[PDB]
């Protein structure tokens, strides 16, 4: 019935990395996990984009072809935004355990991410959801 596939976007600013995951779920199943990690320089140990890539490539190359896992390293000089898109319709959870891990709950990451899981599990992770709204602060 049209069936809205809805985006749930949380954003945790930790370790110097701004991780905002926009995961789209349809029904009770999450289907696309947009894990957009805004990494800042200096904190990563990189002073230049070259040195940054030499640190990032090894990690971003882990996704490779696990599934519909898109790795967009967008970096100018001041920051490196790793826009990740994990497709949960072809996911291999074998390799994923050594990639993204998602070791917040072994039940979630190993058995297949479910909306009930991602919800309770991201709440358990202590992350703050922004939904998709930033102007939520009326006054």
Q: Is 35 helix (H, G, I), strand (E, B) or coil?
A: strand
Strand order in the sheet with 129-131: 70-75, 79-87, 29-40, 17-26, 6-14, 129-131
For the CA atoms of the chain, what is the radius of gyration? Answer: 16
The answer to whether position 29 is within a domain reads yes
* Sole residue written with tokens 């074998």: 94
Q: In this structure, what CATH number is given to the domain that contains residue 100?
A: 3.30.1830.10
CA 30 to chain centre: 13
The DSSP output letter for 114 is: B
Method: NMR
Total structural domains in the chain? 1
- Beta strand extents in 76-139 (DSSP E only): 79-87, 129-131
Residue 137 domain flag: no
Range of the domain at 36: 5-132
Whether 116 maps to a domain, the answer reads: yes
């Amino acid at each position: 019935m049209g069936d809205k596939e809805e985006s749930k976007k949380f954003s945790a600013n930790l370790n110097g990395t701004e991780i905002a995951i926009t995961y789209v779920y349809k029904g009770d199943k999450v289907l696309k996990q947009s894990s957009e990690t805004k990494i800042q320089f200096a904190s990563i140990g990189a002073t230049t984009k070259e040195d940054a890539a030499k640190t990032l490539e090894p990690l971003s190359a882990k996704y490779k072809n696990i599934a519909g896992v898109e790795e967009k390293l967008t970096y100018t000089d001041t920051y490196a935004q790793e826009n990740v898109t994990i497709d949960m319709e072809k996911v291999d959870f074998k390799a994923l355990q050594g990639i993204s891990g998602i070791n917040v709950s072994a039940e979630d990451a190993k058995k297949g991410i479910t909306m009930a899981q991602m919800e309770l599990v991201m709440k358990a992770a202590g992350f703050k959801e922004v939904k998709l709204e930033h102007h939520h602060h009326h006054h």
